[PDB]
């Protein structure tokens, strides 16, 4: 079982519960938690690795 | 085959490829295609099958 380091829950890839994501370094997180911090930062950093990914994140 | 219906690329979660992510609701997409389709809305929205997900899609 893996844990989001964003808000330590652990991350299910069971369908019900919540979106999950997976980055293209291997470290896996809840799509909001990913999601916001990607936002926060404006880019698509790994927040474990620090490993950025060169996507293409829009606001809109 | 997964098929992300943002861009219809394929989506291949187990590789040193783009990001991905799958929904609550079970479909799959590039992170960076959902993310930027989530942050149009402000809204954790399926495309695909319209369900909601009561996330935190924060934008800072
Ligand atoms: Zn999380
Ligand atoms: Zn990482
Ligand atoms: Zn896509
Ligand atoms: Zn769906």
Redesign the interface.
Known sequence: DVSCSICLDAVV?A???????????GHEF???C???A???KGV?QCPNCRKI?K??????
Do not use: K, V
């Open positions: 890839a369908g019900g519960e919540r979106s999950t994501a997976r980055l293209q370094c809840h799509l909001d990913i999601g916001s990607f936002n926060a698509m990914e996507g293409n994140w829009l606001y809109a």
